[PDB]
Symmetry: C3
Subunit: 423 residues, 3 copies
């Protein structure tokens, strides 16, 4: 799996013994915690040396072990497939350390892990929730209605956060117009909002990209009209101070201004945006997470997310496509701070629209593309064959902060394009 | 200015009461500080939970409030326009917290905020301070004179720093030659310099980009000649160790090697460079700031700056242009460490010279371009209509570290391109 | 001229106001002797420890720091150790020298000897790659990779446990033609603790081959895949934690040549940038160990070309001749940081943007952003001689081991660059 079940153990002294102590998740501060895993899950165990003796973790029946960690903070991670149901000791093999207390149980339970019933609204934008290509048609007046909504959202399994959104989801609505169109934008700020909200479209020309006309009090409405003068794939975002705050909380989306031709014909389109959340408590902490101002202004986030939540594009709203289809992903970074090294594991980009230019010729045969915050791009590729294709920021530590998505495509394991064994 | 006046409050216990405590700026460590703002200013208040009780901040007459912050370090920022002159209580609405001492005054004063008289040299390069297009002319020998000067500069309103510069400004002089030119470079290191200084031009071919010939002792002079073989927009920087130190302190600039044709004709040109400063004390601290080596080598800066100073391109040397003009910005990142997501709020780049290639066809209709440290680019756009256009690194937390500039363009508020209300 | 660096923190020790050494051969020593060889460039970083006013001065070099006042206030200075002998570094602030702020710089004749190595050399020579494939038809190509866990020389008195393809970092340079059918054998060495795998960015299907190559120690997996698209592709291990497998050294480049081949060039080089996340700071001697909290927080200690400090300066530098066109295949294993790749004293004639081998290259480029899991191609003509220096232009990474040399014999002064006026 590309979504391993992760457990962090720190060695130390508790309850009169030399033990493993759980870090984060369902095992925080528990001594020799039981690691509950479901049959067939991939298990990642991070061992961190707490007190400075020599330590490993060993599981005999999986021939799985860490390396020996010697100094304080010295770490070793290992993984395995929980293929066998039952109870298995994890223990330290260093002389006497197991006798001294360094031992817990891995419990592998049959059947699939249930989802933890959510407590807050699902704020994840489905990646299939966008308008399709506009017909060929004349330029015209297009009315767009945006509502700024502050609301608690399900950030992770067992963890919530107060999102600020366009229309109660992250990212906001995918806006699709034709170059030459006149956009009549209505911004309604919900009555229950504490904050003023606004919108800056990177595809609008004039003060604040519409921000200077859309500073909207709670329960109020602003209306701005602007001409879509330039074709492109544009991030829009709130532009009420603190703008970084409004952005991290989830107030970003994409505006496609289609060129006169339309974009190249493609079978299937997807809407994906990357952003960061800056919480007081580390990634994996249960309960209501809260915003950490010092982390926000210093660019030290805890969550890296596709479409608003951990599991957004894996559990709650994954991407589905069919072999033979050409796929387009509209990909933008709300941010507010980090440049994505956007990549799809198992695929190569046939076309990449450089710096989100829809008028310059796209680059061809590209593995990975840098997308800045307040930037967007378009990638397309042909699904020649089946598999689970995985969306990542290839700054891959961000896997361990919630940043991973699935493109699910039914087809055989083995064909002429990729198979096990030789010809 | 729409530039927000910012105040940070930490909740805690002081003077035997549960209070707000000021963080940084003119309010550092003051309990229930008076927040002085001028009529019509935009006010940003950052509330940070200090001790771990439930808190907000409320201002009744502005219907302005934070969210409730519960745990230690839990934060909520809110803003509003200081539209009414007078005195207004900010207070915590949690049961009993106001009675317990959580209350201060917002003072909204008539008239415009005065600027603090500066203490140190203005080290900000005006963005209009560059040579215009070279005529059509033959390749020739061009003598360039650079002087490396160490000097105290006005980093912010009430805060100074010891800059290292080419010719007493940040960025250094804009150097403009034609491909094929022979450059006769004289580097004079001022008598009063403590450090050796040098120059590496990204547009020069050979040892250290000229650095191996320009290691200049204080009071001394080096002369190097080099041929401008390749057209491009090149960052030059000091290359005396620690190079990152020489760069953060302000020793970076742009060399344009014009292609034979010249660059496309445009109405107005601008010179902008982004860099970082790594200070012991946080952004917003008054007095003489000093360099923090552990922050520099760990890439944890306090200041993100256009042309050397906070307010460089907003207060002291903003950009001015007229509706209808095509504008070119020569934009480079001295760094030394951070990639800029360069963007102008309210405009789209008609042309972007990707990776500073002046010979490859530019990209078209681009919102935002990544520029690496030791990289530069060219963007142009037509000012279709009026406004204050805002230069940013779209890693927008860097707003809160001094990184913002203004392009001022007078014209009506409402025209056919953007206006309030629906279409007519 | 890769500077010898010494860090001094001011403080109180042995009943005196002193300099205290930080890292290297001088960690925690009071008024440490700074041993330097004739003609070396010396960088001294002064950091204020206790909060009095301080500088460091060396009279016979007219070299000094600035005065540093507050706690953590810093000043670095450098000079060329041109004169052999012993020279006092001291604080010039009133009475501070008398109070104990004084040590000796010792400048010794002759070149610094190399530290005898303790662990295997894990640095890939940048010249160790297959040359251009002839013009030829698509065919079946068998590639053999072995995943080897082994102790390597991270720095000249510092070791680390590397995970590698074939015992070097980066892994083998794989070179095929578009249309080729790749028969990949992955052998995981018997002595490995971890499962290993490979994801090629140039393969189409589950995990870029990772889903077929999860290989137990002492075992072998075989996957076949068609190189459908030309490009310069990073490959890496894709066994969890993938970031862990990557930082430890499991990354390399696959060139899928376009039908034409790449433009003719005199000399080719293989360079990859990555990070290592150690418990102890950069410059610490002995067995370094991995710091998980630093890895997931993206706070590395080592920024490296081809696996080691001195990889492309001391142990395996780049060599070329004036007049030659040079191509560098440059990729970022990472796992986390985007390189601002630049060669000091050169300009890129061609840059293959985002590693596109089919789209026209950009021309006359100083510096190119390469993301982690990204690669590019740059070429340039060596018009003249010199030591050309490969850097990430996020230049604080110099102070974490990230620097390489391209050595090219030729005169100091020619018509392209020289000392006097013309
Ligand atoms: Cu143990
Ligand atoms: Cu908002
Ligand atoms: Cu924006
Ligand atoms: Cu309170
Ligand atoms: Cu300098
Ligand atoms: Cu440089
Ligand atoms: Cu002293
Ligand atoms: Cu591996
Ligand atoms: Cu990859």
């Amino acid at each position: 799996s590309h979504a391993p079940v992760v457990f962090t153990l720190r060695t130390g002294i508790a309850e009169g013994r030399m033990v493993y102590i759980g870090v984060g998740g369902d095992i925080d501060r528990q001594v020799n915690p039981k690691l509950v895993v479901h049959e067939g899950e991939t298990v990642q165990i991070n061992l961190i040396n707490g007190e400075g003796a020599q330590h490993d973790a060993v599981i005999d029946q999986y021939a799985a072990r860490s390396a020996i960690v010697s100094g304080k903070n010295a770490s070793s991670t290992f993984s395995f497939i929980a293929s066998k149901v039952g109870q298995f000791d994890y223990y330290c093999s260093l002389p006497g350390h197991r006798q001294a207390g360094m031992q817990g149980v891995l419990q592998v339970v049959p059947g699939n892990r249930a989802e933890m019933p959510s407590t807050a609204a699902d704020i994840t934008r489905d990646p299939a929730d966008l308008p399709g290509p506009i017909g060929a048609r004349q330029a015209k007046t297009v009315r767009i209605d945006l509502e700024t909504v502050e609301l608690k959202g399900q950030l992770d399994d067992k963890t919530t956060y107060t999102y600020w959104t366009f229309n109660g989801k992250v990212p906001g609505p995918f806006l699709r117009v034709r170059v030459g169109d006149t956009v009549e934008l209505h911004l309604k700020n919900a009555k229950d909002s504490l904050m003023i909200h606004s919108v800056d479209f990177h595809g609008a020309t004039g003060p604040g990209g519409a921000a200077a006309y859309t500073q909207t009090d709670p329960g109020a409405e602003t209306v701005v009209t602007f001409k879509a003068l330039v074709p492109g794939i544009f991030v829009y975002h709130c532009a009420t101070p603190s703008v970084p705050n409004h952005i991290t909380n989830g107030m970003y989306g994409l505006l496609l201004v289609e060129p006169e031709g339309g974009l190249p014909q493609v079978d299937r389109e997807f809407y994906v945006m990357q952003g960061e959340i800056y919480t007081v408590k580390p990634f994996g902490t249960s309960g209501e997470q809260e915003m950490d101002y010092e982390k926000l202004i210093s660019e030290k986030p805890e969550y890296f997310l596709f479409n608003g939540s951990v599991g957004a594009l894996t559990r709650t709203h994954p991407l589905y496509a069919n072999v033979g289809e050409t796929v387009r992903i509209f990909f933008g970074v709300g941010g507010p701070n980090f440049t994505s090294s956007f990549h799809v594991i198992g695929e190569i980009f046939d076309h990449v629209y450089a710096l989100g230019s829809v008028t310059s010729p796209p680059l061809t045969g590209v593995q990975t593309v840098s997308v800045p915050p307040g930037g967007a791009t378009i990638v397309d590729f042909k699904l020649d064959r089946g598999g689970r294709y995985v969306l990542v920021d290839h700054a891959l530590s961000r896997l361990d902060h919630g940043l991973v998505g699935f493109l699910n495509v039914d087809g055989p394991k083995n064909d002429a394009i990729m198979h096990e064994g030789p010809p």
